[PDB]
């Protein structure tokens, strides 16, 4: 189904798992990528992907964009390259669907989504000055698979 | 103590000095309390009323200033107790106080105790206090008879600091009569 059905924040927070049963599992394989044993401060450059509009991103989109970005970093740096990316959001809002007409219309559980306010960083990668152009490209592919417009922002890096 | 959400008891509860559940039930009468308290060596009796910033004591007596009228014997016993109650009871009648309710604090209501002796004294002093005759010790033990019979089993003199040998419940009688006089300094 289309994201047009769930992209806006137009419903109350629905995250209490103590009253919601049958919630589908998340498609997000991993949140901590690269070299998780190493530290974030052990890198010269740090670039985050900033969301420009306040929206809702379904776990399907998080997996697709996280996948297509890290897949690039693995292709250009290797399965054990020097870097570490971070998907700093987890899908908490549960989604319904009215799948009778408008009689007894409360929907059944169909998925999960992460709410991101405009200005927040969805992803944050850490790499050396050399790999700085690869992380940018990996993010270019990432903002192509999520609803909002995005700003690729280099936080600690004056080696431009 | 442990954190923000923690509950610390009221001060007089931490100090193990005030039984708040009994205190409330006491205050419900609307009458002033007769605070009967004892110590290892002494006895005490206060007449307390309620006040905006804390209790107001209108009258009181201590087993120490008992001698001030004739005492020359120990003060942590039955005769001492009764007399201290009567004394306090009389100073009370003088302040315009007419009735009271016995407050025994964290003591036990054992039949024939000193708090009851204190209570009988105040009743004898002319105060209207809710009581039960068959819980107060028999007249003789109040006088100090039980103690005379103890030293009757002498062998080794009971009272170290000489007041006598066989002791004197008669001194008690002399003291009671001395207080029942109307002139006496109160």
């Amino acid at each position: 189904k289309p994201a047009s059905m769930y992209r806006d924040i137009d419903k109350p927070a629905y995250t209490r798992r103590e009253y919601i049963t049958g919630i589908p599992g998340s498609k997000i394989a991993q949140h901590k990528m690269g070299r998780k044993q190493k530290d974030a401060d052990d890198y010269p450059v740090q670039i985050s992907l900033i969301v420009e509009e306040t929206v809702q991103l379904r776990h399907g989109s998080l997996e697709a964009s996280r996948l297509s970005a890290n897949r690039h970093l693995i292709k250009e740096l290797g399965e054990e390259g020097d870097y570490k990316m971070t998907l700093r959001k987890f899908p908490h809002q549960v989604l319904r669907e009215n799948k009778d007409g408008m009689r007894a219309a409360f929907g059944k559980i169909v998925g999960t989504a992460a709410r991101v306010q405009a200005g927040e960083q969805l992803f944050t990668a850490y790499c050396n000055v050399e790999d700085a152009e690869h992380v940018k490209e990996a993010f270019r592919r990432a903002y192509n698979k999520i609803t909002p417009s995005c700003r690729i922002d280099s936080s600690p890096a004056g080696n431009a | 103590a442990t954190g923000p959400r923690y509950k610390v008891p009221m001060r007089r509860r931490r100090e193990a000095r005030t039984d708040y559940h009994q205190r409330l039930r006491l205050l419900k009468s609307g009458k002033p309390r007769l605070v009967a308290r004892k110590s290892n060596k002494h006895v005490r009796a206060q007449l307390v009323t309620l006040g905006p910033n804390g209790d107001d004591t209108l009258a009181s007596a201590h087993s120490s200033d008992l001698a001030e009228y004739g005492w020359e014997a120990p003060t942590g016993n039955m005769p001492s107790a009764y007399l201290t109650g009567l004394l306090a009871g009389l100073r009370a009648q003088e302040a315009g106080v007419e009735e009271a309710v016995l407050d025994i604090g964290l003591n036990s209501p054992t039949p024939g105790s000193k708090v009851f002796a204190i209570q009988e004294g105040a009743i004898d002093a002319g105060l209207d206090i809710p009581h039960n005759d068959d819980v107060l010790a028999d007249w003789q033990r109040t006088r100090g008879a039980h103690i005379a019979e103890y030293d009757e089993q002498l062998e080794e003199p009971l009272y170290s600091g000489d007041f006598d040998a066989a002791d004197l419940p008669e001194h008690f009688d002399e003291l009671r009569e001395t207080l029942l006089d109307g002139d006496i300094e109160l």
Partner: protein, 95 residues
């Protein structure tokens, strides 16, 4: 409201804040008020008896005598006058 009992929607107003938990001081439970006196109505979560209907919480009545140890306080609900039976444990002097 899914139901219509007296304790409906009273979770917040009839619950003690953690630090105020436990039995309350006897001083205010034995307080004395005079007729014509202005008093604030507020239930004490810790005191079970002498309570009034929760809707009246927050009012400011006028003492007009008593019925036993409890007090008779006059108030105006909306535009209708009402007489409330309440103990001092749930009352406070105004001003």
């Amino acid at each position: 409201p899914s139901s219509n009992g007296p304790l409906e929607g009273t979770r917040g107003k009839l619950k003690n804040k953690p630090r105020d938990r436990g039995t309350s001081p006897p001083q205010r439970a034995v307080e004395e008020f005079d007729d014509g006196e202005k008093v604030h109505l507020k239930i004490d979560p810790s005191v079970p008896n002498g309570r009034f209907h929760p809707r009246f919480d927050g009012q400011t009545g006028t003492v007009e005598g008593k019925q036993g140890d409890a007090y008779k306080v006059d108030i105006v609900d909306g535009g209708k006058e009402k007489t409330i039976i309440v103990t001092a444990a749930h009352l406070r002097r105004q001003e």
